[PDB]
Amino acid sequence: KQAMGTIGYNQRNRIDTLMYLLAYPQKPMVKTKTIELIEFEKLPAGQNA
Amino acid sequence: DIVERHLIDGDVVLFNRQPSLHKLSIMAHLARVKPHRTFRFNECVCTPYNADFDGDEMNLHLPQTEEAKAEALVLMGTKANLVTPRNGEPLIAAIQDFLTGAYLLTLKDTFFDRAKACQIIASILVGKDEKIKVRLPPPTILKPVTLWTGKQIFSVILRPSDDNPVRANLRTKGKQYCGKGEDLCANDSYVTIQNSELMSGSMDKGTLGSGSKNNIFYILLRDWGQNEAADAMSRLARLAPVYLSNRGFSIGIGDVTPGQGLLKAKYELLNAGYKKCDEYIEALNTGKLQQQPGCTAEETLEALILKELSVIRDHAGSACLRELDKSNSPLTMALCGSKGSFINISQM
Amino acid sequence: AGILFEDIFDVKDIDPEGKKFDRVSRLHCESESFKMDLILDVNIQIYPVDLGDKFRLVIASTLYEDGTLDDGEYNPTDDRPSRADQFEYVMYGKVYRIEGDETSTEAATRLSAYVSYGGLLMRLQGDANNLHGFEVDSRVYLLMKKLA
Amino acid sequence: TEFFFHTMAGREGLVDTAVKTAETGYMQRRLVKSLEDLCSQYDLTVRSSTGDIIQFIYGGDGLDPAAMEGKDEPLEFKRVLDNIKAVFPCPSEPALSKNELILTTESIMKKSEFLCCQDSFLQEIKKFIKGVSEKIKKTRDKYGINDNGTTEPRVLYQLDRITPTQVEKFLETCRDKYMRAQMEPGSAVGALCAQSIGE
Amino acid sequence: TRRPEIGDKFSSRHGQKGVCGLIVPQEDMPFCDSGICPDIIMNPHGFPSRMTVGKLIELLAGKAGVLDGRFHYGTAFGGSKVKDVCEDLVRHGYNYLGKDYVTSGITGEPLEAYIYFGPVYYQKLKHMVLDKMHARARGPRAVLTRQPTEGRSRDGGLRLGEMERDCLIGYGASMLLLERLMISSDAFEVDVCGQCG
Amino acid sequence: AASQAVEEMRSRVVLGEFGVRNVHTTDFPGNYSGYDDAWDQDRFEKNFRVDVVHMDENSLEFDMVGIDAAIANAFRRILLAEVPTMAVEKVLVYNNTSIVQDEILAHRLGLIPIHADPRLFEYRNQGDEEGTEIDTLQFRLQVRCTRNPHAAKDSSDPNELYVNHKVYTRHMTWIPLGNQADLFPEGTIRPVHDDILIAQLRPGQEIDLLMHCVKGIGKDHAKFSPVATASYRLLPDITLLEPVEGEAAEELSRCFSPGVIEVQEVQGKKVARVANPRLDTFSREIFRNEKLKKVVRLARVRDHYIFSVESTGVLPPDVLVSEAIKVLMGKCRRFLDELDAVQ
Amino acid sequence: KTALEMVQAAGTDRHCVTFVLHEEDHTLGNSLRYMIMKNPEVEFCGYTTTHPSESKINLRIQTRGTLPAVEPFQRGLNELMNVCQHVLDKFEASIKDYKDQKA
Amino acid sequence: MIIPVRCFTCGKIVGNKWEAYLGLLQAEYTEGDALDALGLKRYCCRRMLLAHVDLIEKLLNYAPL
Amino acid sequence: QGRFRGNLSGKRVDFSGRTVISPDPNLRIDEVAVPVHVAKILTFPEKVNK
RNA sequence: UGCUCGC
Ligand SMILES: Nc1nc2c(ncn2[C@@H]2O[C@H](COP(=O)(O)OP(=O)(O)OP(=O)(O)O)[C@@H](O)[C@H]2O)c(=O)[nH]1
Ligand SMILES: Nc1ncnc2c1ncn2[C@@H]1O[C@H](COP(=O)(O)OP(=O)(O)OP(=O)(O)O)C[C@H]1O
Ligand SMILES: [Mg+2]
Ligand SMILES: [Zn+2]
Ligand SMILES: [Zn+2]
Asked: What's the CATH number for C5-148?
């Protein structure tokens, strides 16, 4: 719920009081079917290291 | 004149975690300035603060009076509060990655040549230990190959130099002590140290942890003062990570996988327990079931089913512990008591 | 000669409690000349042993046969005629315990010497006459040589 | 189903800890607010702020719980004796018999510096000395050790070896530890008790 | 634009929240036979007490996937089994348990135990040391009670709570408590009449 | 016997089922009785050798025999960090209308390698942000994206609709300073790959910037690292304790690498043997087969290191190894000069 | 100001010396440790890092007899320099013959 | 947002192999064979190219232009 | 938040900081590492003597 | 004042 990552495709025009974005977000390699259902892979919030 | 000088090295400074349960939650330390942006301290003092380095924020206060500074350094000194006033047990002691490192170091399998032993010994020669002689101990085996055991390297921590008057002596039982060896246990779990030299046994939480008495650091504190115990703890915290990194300690999915005999035993135990539970259910529902004293028939059935499930659990755990091979990282960390236990291993 | 003890032993068991350690084994040995039992930790990786092996073992106060007890420091690089030249497996330890036998309630004549070679345990048990010269906090050399 | 039951157990533990935090916080606050007034005076009597005496002596004996080496006992005589024997091994002095040990103990204990010590600690020291003397006597009777010091196997003297130097060192160490383990006057004993009960 | 440093909180998608303890150079990092150096080194001791076998399974599945160019599924009560990813690892020439032969970067000698390498999906949290760093000079005070303000945005100071006062009482440091709670916080000089009080 | 075990400990590193043994270097004087491990320059020069097995552009592989793990790790670390190169450090921006952030753009530009020879430049002194001809290089990047005047009616693909919408590193133009144009021929100072995608643009947006590059080492920042992957591994030597034949021999070919174990029909029956232990990666899959565990002995040669050096294209890897050895020699000479100045 | 010597105590004993080396790391420390450990007159050689924040290392040398422990330091440095020169020459010759035989 | 130029672990140049990879996706090549043909032996570059999401065009769709 | 509990028994003080903690085994047990930034803010009044 | 968080 506090993970840092992209918000949406309009995150650049969006102006909020506090926003955290990731430079090079990457979709997880081990993804649950729920991730595909909620389309989280289109907006990842982490990196694989 | 008054000069509002910056915080420099040597200033007594209070360090506290806002959740305070006992008095040891706040201690007066010596400030050393570092270019980073976090409050860094020795992890051995983590047990009093009850910190876990997962985002905890701690407070740091600077007294504005010489009298307050002296009172903080004397009464709330870290070396002067190594034991809690509740029961006298030492709280500032070795912790995870220090119990396991010292345990793997003091194992009987360890045999170091001259170069590796010299490196591990020199890994602690920093700070106030830069003005003392090394005092390389004589090797144990010398004719076939000149090898230094890990126990001598660990004892070097107790008595680094020749002029050091520390003479540590201890005789206690370990966690995996059999109960009959009396310093001749097959597992080598009887700790015996004479003249700051580890004569027998392997270090663990029972001897290096903050559990209770018989700790080597507690013995040093009670026999030779606070400074010697603090120096020994610093040498341990500087030596154990170096050896633990140079040797390598990892856990994998293969360290927790079950064996074939373990699977067969688990299947047989599950079958037997389910059959006995079905027999108890049939006895209670149809017929008369032996009622245990002090409870009803339903509570008796509940107790019997819990007993059978616990039998299955403990027998599967014993089978897993027997089928597990040595050098297993979960089993190794469970034996030394650094983290986890046999119950967690059996569950996982 | 600083030889405190010397006897030929035969191994009767290698690991009575299982293969606990990869490099170290707990050999049990019995002497032929006397009834001296020996429970000794040995390194099989560098000095392999078998069940039926028979070896001569010598516990000496000093490593030099001339009687010079000057053992302030040991230099492995120094080359000189010493006792270790006549043996194959040499260890350096300290006799850290002398314990009387408790099995015999009365008229007991058996003692046991516990020596810690850097954690490797050696219990030499037998008649107190053979253990003459053994004292606590005394550093000694063990020399073991396998025989045919 | 097993995952659901495990999550139930985890949530039960979480709510238990959540209630425990606040409950023990309130209990600690009450205990400290009640016990913060007591202090150890210089006359070894714990008195309140108004001057009323709560105890004529703290704990009945007057020892520091932080300096309690044993299980609610000031010293572990066995470990102290072993440490004295190991640190100061005198090879040029003969062993002591039971009678000689008792005699030297009675001679050393009757000195002036041991008079200010409490009687219970002296009785415990006498009991430990009698026990170790009985052990030495049993060993010498088992192995036929003669008190004259002319037994041929000298290794027999290494079973239970004690010298008057070690006896003096042990007695002085025990006396110093008992003196340094007493309650230092001025300590806030009440706050320490409140914290050691609340934690 | 901020770079990870000491104090930044990191998560590993398994509740294993952590803080960057040290930033070592690349040459100090251990290396495998292929020459891959790890980005994040995590403590194994966190596994036994928490029993996070799911993290190991995710690591193994991710390694198999990046080896064969696939996306394994970690679906609840299902997903890719361990046998399939083990076969995928053994087919590509890697170990079937993730543990690989690794040489220490510092000493240049191989490690006695194999290291568990694999790609893990780590996520950075909003908790930063830069935003949480706070230091309070004399600064401003409140109008009602002349004491430091509450929050960091208000340039406030840390509060010595009741339990901290209890600890200071237990220690017996009267002068330190007096300096903290009277001299350094709300010291003032009033005028009292000795006749009427 | 005992001598065989001592030789195996002092020459081989055995890999067990649960852990690796004999990993510490022990050939030192005083550790062994029947061996004089004292330093000898003649024996070292006799036993040491270097054999290159593969060498192409931005890739090198060579075996060193006789060197130790300490010097090998030193060479590896010098190659990784202590080899200086040229990389972008300063970024002067003029009206960057791109969606990509300015700091992110500068960070991406800094990671772009430069084909300039670092030996011909010097380290910039403390400060001196203006830069001189000797210790800096300038790269101008000016890309203005606009709509294509001639395109299809639909033009769904961005390539047909817009021009210069993807700012590749080929748009970077080296701007000579002073006499750098005469010293460096045209085409030498340029981006290495020439195909790195820096950013993507849209009509109206423009990216105008200048990049000041100075000499630096990889220890300060990873952007100066010339080698992509510079590592070394011990040469494996798989040995068979007993002759393995039959169908189980085929299992060997399936347990190890496909190219190390070969099966041959000497008498009409298949027997396995070690063909090329170099190709093996030590997957330790032979431990799964219960019967075949006690028939093989996996080991690594202690004094045989295969170095694999894949560079980023700044300079050939042989020159990289030479410069690493030269940097180590320079450190040794600097410390010797300091010691001589002390005494 | 890079390499500084420190005696074991105020007595200024040349048997046990500590060399503090600035702007260095594990590379040169381990290389010099290996090159000087083979000296038969060295009882104890060991390098350590004070703190990962600062770039400095501390080597400690204790000899057997009356060696000033500075002569083994220079010996190890010269031996490492000779080894580096030899490996450089060998690598250059190897690369040259490889280029010759490839064409 | 955009493909990084350098690999996080090793440091191999990977930004220049992105669009061509997309070409291999426009062709009949799968993921594994395309990553093999691109020259990525170690799995770190394979993870870098495979787990990367191309969010630059989605942002340019919201660009002023 | 009353006067006794919020302003008399427990109150706020200056010359103090709050920061996240990170492990560092190379320091003694009686020593604590302070960042340079906080060290420049928290000042100590030293009296000029001989 | 409210609330979401951080242990
Ligand atoms: N609804 C609402 N009430 C507030 C707010 N801030 C303060 N209050 C009320 O005021 C009381 C606390 O006052 P403070 O927060 O101390 O006011 P302050 O910050 O000193 O005000 P300033 O001096 O202007 O900064 C609470 O009991 C709240 O009911 C707010 O933002 N919204
Ligand atoms: N409400 C609170 N009051 C006091 N301390 C708290 C509170 N919430 C968190 N903390 C601090 O955080 C610590 C709680 O961690 P703890 O409960 O021991 O582990 P955990 O959160 O269960 O982690 P696991 O779930 O076991 O991984 C201890 C305490 O100092
Ligand atoms: Mg926490
Ligand atoms: Zn008045
Ligand atoms: Zn890569």
From this structure: 2.40.50.140
